[PDB]
Amino acid sequence: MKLSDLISRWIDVEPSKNAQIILRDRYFMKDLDGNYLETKWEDVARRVARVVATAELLNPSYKKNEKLDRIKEWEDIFFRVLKARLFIPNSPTLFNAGLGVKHDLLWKPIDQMTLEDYEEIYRSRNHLHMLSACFVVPVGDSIEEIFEAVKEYALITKVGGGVGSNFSELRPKGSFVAGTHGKASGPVSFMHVFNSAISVVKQALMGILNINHPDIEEFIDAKKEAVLNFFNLSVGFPMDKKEILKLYEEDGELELSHPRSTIRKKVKIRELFRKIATNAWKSGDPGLAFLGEMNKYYPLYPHRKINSTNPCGEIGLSDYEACNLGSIDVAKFYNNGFVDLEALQELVQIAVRFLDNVIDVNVFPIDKITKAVKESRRLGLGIMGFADLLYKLEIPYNSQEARDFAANLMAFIALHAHRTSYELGKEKGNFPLLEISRYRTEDNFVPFAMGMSNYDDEIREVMKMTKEFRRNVALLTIAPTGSISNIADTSSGLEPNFLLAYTRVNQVLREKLNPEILKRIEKELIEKGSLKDIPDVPEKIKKVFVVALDIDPMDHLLMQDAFQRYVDNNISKTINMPQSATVDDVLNVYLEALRTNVRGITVYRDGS
Amino acid sequence: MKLSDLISRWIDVEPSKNAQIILRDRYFMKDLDGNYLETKWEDVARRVARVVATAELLNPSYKKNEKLDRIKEWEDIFFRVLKARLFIPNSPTLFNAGLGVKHDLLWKPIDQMTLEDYEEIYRSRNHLHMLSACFVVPVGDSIEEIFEAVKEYALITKVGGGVGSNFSELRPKGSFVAGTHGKASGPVSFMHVFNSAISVVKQGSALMGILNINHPDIEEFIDAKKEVLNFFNLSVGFPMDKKEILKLYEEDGELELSHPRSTIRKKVKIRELFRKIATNAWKSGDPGLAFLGEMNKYYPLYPHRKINSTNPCGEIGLSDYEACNLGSIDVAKFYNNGFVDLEALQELVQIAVRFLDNVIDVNVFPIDKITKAVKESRRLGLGIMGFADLLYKLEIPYNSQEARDFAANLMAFIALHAHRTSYELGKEKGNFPLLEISRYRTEDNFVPFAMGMSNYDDEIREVMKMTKEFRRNVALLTIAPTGSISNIADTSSGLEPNFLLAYTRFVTKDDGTKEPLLYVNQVLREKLNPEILKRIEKELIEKGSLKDIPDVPEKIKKVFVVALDIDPMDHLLMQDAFQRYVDNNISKTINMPQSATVDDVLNVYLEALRTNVRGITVYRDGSL
Numbered sequence A: 001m002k003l004s005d006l007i008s009r010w011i012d013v014e015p016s017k018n019a020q021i022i023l024r025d026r027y028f029m030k031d032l033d034g035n036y037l038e039t040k041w042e043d044v045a046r047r048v049a050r051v052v053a054t055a056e057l058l059n060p061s062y063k064k065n066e067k068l069d070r071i072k073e074w075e076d077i078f079f080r081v082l083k084a085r086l087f088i089p090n091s092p093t094l095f096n097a098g099l100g101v102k103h104d105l106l107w108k109p110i111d112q113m114t115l116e117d118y119e120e121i122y123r124s125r126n127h128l129h130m131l132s133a134c135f136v137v138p139v140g141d142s143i144e145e146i147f148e149a150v151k152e153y154a155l156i157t158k159v160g161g162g163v164g165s166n167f168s169e170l171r172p173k174g175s176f177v178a179g180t181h182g183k184a185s186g187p188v189s190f191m192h193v194f195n196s197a198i199s200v201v202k203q204a205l206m207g208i209l210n211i212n213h214p215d216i217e218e219f220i221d222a223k224k225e226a227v228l229n230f231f232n233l234s235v236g237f238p239m240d241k242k243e244i245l246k247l248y249e250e251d252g253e254l255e256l257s258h259p260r261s262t263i264r265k266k267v268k269i270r271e272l273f274r275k276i277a278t279n280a281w282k283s284g285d286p287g288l289a290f291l292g293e294m295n296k297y298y299p300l301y302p303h304r305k306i307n308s309t310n311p312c313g314e315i316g317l318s319d320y321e322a323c324n325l326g327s328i329d330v331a332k333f334y335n336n337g338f339v340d341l342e343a344l345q346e347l348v349q350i351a352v353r354f355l356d357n358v359i360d361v362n363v364f365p366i367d368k369i370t371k372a373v374k375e376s377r378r379l380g381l382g383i384m385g386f387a388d389l390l391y392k393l394e395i396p397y398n399s400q401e402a403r404d405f406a407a408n409l410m411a412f413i414a415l416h417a418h419r420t421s422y423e424l425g426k427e428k429g430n431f432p433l434l435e436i437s438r439y440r441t442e443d444n445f446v447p448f449a450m451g452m453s454n455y456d457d458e459i460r461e462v463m464k465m466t467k468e469f470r471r472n473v474a475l476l477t478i479a480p481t482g483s484i485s486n487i488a489d490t491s492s493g494l495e496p497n498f499l500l501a502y503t504r505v506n507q508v509l510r511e512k513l514n515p516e517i518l519k520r521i522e523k524e525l526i527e528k529g530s531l532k533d534i535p536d537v538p539e540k541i542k543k544v545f546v547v548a549l550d551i552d553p554m555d556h557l558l559m560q561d562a563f564q565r566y567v568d569n570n571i572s573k574t575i576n577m578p579q580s581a582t583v584d585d586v587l588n589v590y591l592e593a594l595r596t597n598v599r600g601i602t603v604y605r606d607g608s
Numbered sequence B: 001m002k003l004s005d006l007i008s009r010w011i012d013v014e015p016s017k018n019a020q021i022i023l024r025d026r027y028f029m030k031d032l033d034g035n036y037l038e039t040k041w042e043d044v045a046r047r048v049a050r051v052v053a054t055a056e057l058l059n060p061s062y063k064k065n066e067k068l069d070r071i072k073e074w075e076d077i078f079f080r081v082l083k084a085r086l087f088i089p090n091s092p093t094l095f096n097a098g099l100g101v102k103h104d105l106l107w108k109p110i111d112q113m114t115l116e117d118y119e120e121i122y123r124s125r126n127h128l129h130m131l132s133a134c135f136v137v138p139v140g141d142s143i144e145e146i147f148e149a150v151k152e153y154a155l156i157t158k159v160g161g162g163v164g165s166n167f168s169e170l171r172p173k174g175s176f177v178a179g180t181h182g183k184a185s186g187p188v189s190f191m192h193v194f195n196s197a198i199s200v201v202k203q204g205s206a207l208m209g210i211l212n213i214n215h216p217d218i219e220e221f222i223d224a225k226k227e228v229l230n231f232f233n234l235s236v237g238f239p240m241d242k243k244e245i246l247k248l249y250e251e252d253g254e255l256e257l258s259h260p261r262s263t264i265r266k267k268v269k270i271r272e273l274f275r276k277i278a279t280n281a282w283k284s285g286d287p288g289l290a291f292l293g294e295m296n297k298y299y300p301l302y303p304h305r306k307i308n309s310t311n312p313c314g315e316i317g318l319s320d321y322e323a324c325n326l327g328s329i330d331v332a333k334f335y336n337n338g339f340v341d342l343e344a345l346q347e348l349v350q351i352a353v354r355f356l357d358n359v360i361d362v363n364v365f366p367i368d369k370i371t372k373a374v375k376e377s378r379r380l381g382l383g384i385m386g387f388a389d390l391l392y393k394l395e396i397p398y399n400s401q402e403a404r405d406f407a408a409n410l411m412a413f414i415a416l417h418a419h420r421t422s423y424e425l426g427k428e429k430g431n432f433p434l435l436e437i438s439r440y441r442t443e444d445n446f447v448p449f450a451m452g453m454s455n456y457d458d459e460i461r462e463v464m465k466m467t468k469e470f471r472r473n474v475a476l477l478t479i480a481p482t483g484s485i486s487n488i489a490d491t492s493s494g495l496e497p498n499f500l501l502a503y504t505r506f507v508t509k510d511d512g513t514k515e516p517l518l519y520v521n522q523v524l525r526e527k528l529n530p531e532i533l534k535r536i537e538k539e540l541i542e543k544g545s546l547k548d549i550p551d552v553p554e555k556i557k558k559v560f561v562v563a564l565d566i567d568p569m570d571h572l573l574m575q576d577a578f579q580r581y582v583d584n585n586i587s588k589t590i591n592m593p594q595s596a597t598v599d600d601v602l603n604v605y606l607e608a609l610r611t612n613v614r615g616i617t618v619y620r621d622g623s624l
Ligand SMILES: Nc1nc2c(ncn2[C@H]2C[C@H](O)[C@@H](COP(=O)(O)OP(=O)(O)OP(=O)(O)O)O2)c(=O)[nH]1
Pocket: A141, A142, A143, A144, A170, A171, A176, A177, A178, A179, A181, A183, A184, A185, A186, B128, B157, B158, B200, B201, B202, B203
């Protein structure tokens, strides 16, 4: 089925009252008195498509005597996809698209748009016109660099970004400082300054410290349980997942050292892991960040290095790199018991172009960020509504069927996104750093593990094409989609529905479940939070309409690995554990985690 | 006496075991390994004398024929006054002089010093060779400038500096932020980030925050350290005239609180405002008052440049990015048979002004705007220590018009020969680049302080008129707390009276740790009957004063007064006396008895409004 006919199925389904409240509440623009310039999703969709279509102004393939036709065609596609909610960019794009721009240019009908109007949009874009979710800055080992990083955190946070850092450059507590006053206070003491700064600016960050840092134990307890309430903390792992699994299995030792220090120490790699698991068992933090696995697949490694992710895990980024995200609602792609792959590939093509185009109309607070993005052009195309899609296809999330379905779905998406990048590379220019990347300097480089689809062969050959042309260094990610999935009235990222009914009722359950059976049980379901131990609901309804805590921790982890084989950046997935999980259940998640292809790990025990 | 014979009375006198603990603790240079490179105060004096003498390379009055001789001579004279402990520069000069310089060069016998050695000292001073105690930085009304300022605080703090800011440019809480419809959080909110930063930079081994009385968040500020900005000293700033403010108070007027970049305005009764301050000061000692209006009155560069804040302890009003290096002369050592040896003292002022102006040439700052500002103005802070101990020798009670009159004359004398040295130096080396646009030039009869308490005024005016032509420095004098350097010199701090005449500081001799070492004022030891000292001694340590002790001569009770024997107004009036003859400001705590009320604090504030004081710090005996 053609995308245009898909769009027509969705373009006029009104956003729920839930979605509409969140929109009014924070997406609809407001004039200098707090009066509405936008009153429905259509206004947002028009504004956003028009701002992003403006980037086509820079397309060397067009000419004068063609640009305006071509530009308006892109705004029109962008607009229809957006209004239909089949693809939605990350929040910062929705908020900040068109800031600076004369109101009478942002909502004026497309037919009336002139080449001058598009140019004025382009140039009236102000310093707040920042449209990317994800940032990473370094924190060098000097008071100067620490405080410049604190400044950068403030500026990024002001304009709407989430920011992450690896703090491992900072010498541990006690090290010599060539001076007078004595000793380094260490990474963790400095993260408290970042926390204070952000707590003020925000009246949601990531901080990583590597496993072999002498202050790792202090760091692991850092949010126990002084505090760093604005940080998500992850333990970094710069070395092979292989080496770390093996060292653990052999009950090895890890040498804690730092180059700019004489602080050395030895700890049993298993005691450290138990320390992590115990804390995570209690409160969720710290997560794990398989930095070395990220770099394995990093087309620009080792002449660039991923040391951190963004606050939620899904983009591992090099220094001063940012990435703009967007998500395709796959639940809208259901048709007759099948995923309409005809329409999907067309959207994937449109979506990659939109995301590449956001780069050109984005404004960042820091020149080093502007330049890092220009050279790499990293994108984060993902999916939402996956769980809801599986409900429609009558596939239980915790099953091998579901994961083989995921892997193939993600493989398909990966294929056409990367083919779209080759084609944009042709049309617009390669990403400046193509020459020094492994897409070029290597043969048969692929930036994810694969090994769970029949598209591998095809993917392995699109990857050879991108030797000559490639617009972007990587293109895929699965994001949390906390807000935009709510806008799209769909499930979040790859996650299972956390609940089917929550007065604080899933639409697919409402259709597939016989009403009155639905009316009877809906009170009991709200309390018990699962269909599992509601008696007299059909075994097939019970099996398919699984919630997060119906799905055991390995089924969560194996879903993540399935998607991650076909994702070139990383994945936001929470490994939900039942309240009765033990610290030993967490270690087991961690070990399975080191054997699968996942690039990181977040666990969360119900009740903790 | 000539200074040479005074140096002789003092040069082979070693610091007390007390001072030696301080030196070992924080002043003696250790090496990359943690081994001592210095073990005697004399090693410090050597290193510091040699480094500041190095600034003589730049002296454009010296033919290369004479340079090594001229430099070695200043090195020796600097070495002599420092070893004797007659003058001591602020602590960072002592901690950081010679950082970056090869160790062979810093202590080696002088007679082995070649002109290349001096050049080598000069070239190798590293990024940590920061020799100034006092700094002011602006904090502009934007996120980027707020956070550039936090970065400046951390970098100044790291190298030894004390830093202050006026936060009044930040727009009040809840105010409008362009293009967000999100609201500004306010100055106090960001002061917490500055505090957090510094609590971490100083983790293990100080700051001034000022908000102006008319800021719409002033009441919040006044309470900011109520039961916290534990790393800040807070003052309320008055950029208007003290007259306006005194008058407004007497009329029981209202004050308008408004901000240039906000719609938020409010009207508050000044009396009610002052009482809020007084109560909080009465409770905790914060906030102080900062009469910036009154500093700008005497600032040679105003309105071209403006003073908006002081450093941590208040004794230096500084324009944006300005720093100031301080040093203090021990006046107790200049006692010669019931008189102050003015002859020896004048030579030491000549020497100490030159030393402090040499610090500026060997000084490295972490920030370019600071270097520039400092090179433009060349503000010095020469002060005194051991003044209370000097009064003891002269048998003068601190709390008397006699003490105040002597203090004004002393200061007036010092100020005279200090500015006359700046004259000489300006001829010899060049004028401070901004002499031309300063009030020393664009006016007749500009004096950078009030005067009115000395025979010396007429002559001071002579000298100030002279410096329309030749002037090395924009201002030259301060009185500092001297918290550390007065302990090194074994003498009383700044202009402050002795807090106690006798106490204990337990030995911590380890190796069977115990021993209470009982201190008694060295001048009390010399003028009180060892037979009396014998018996009263233990009542003195329980009661903290001599006053209500049976059988101590009435004239020793009157002379050996402590800080709490001296009433608030006599604290205040002494401050006034010095400030009449100081172009920077004055560090002075107005000590108050536990029994003092908030009305008593209020009256100190009204009285300071009538005197020439440039700001007020009060402390109530048992508050904190
Ligand atoms: N808490 C605290 N940390 C400091 C202080 N000074 C330096 N550090 C820490 C910050 C960095 O983690 C590390 C290096 O600091 P810097 O590069 O600023 O020190 P510097 O270049 O003077 O000595 P270095 O050559 O790096 O050993 O030591 C300080 O005063 N306080």
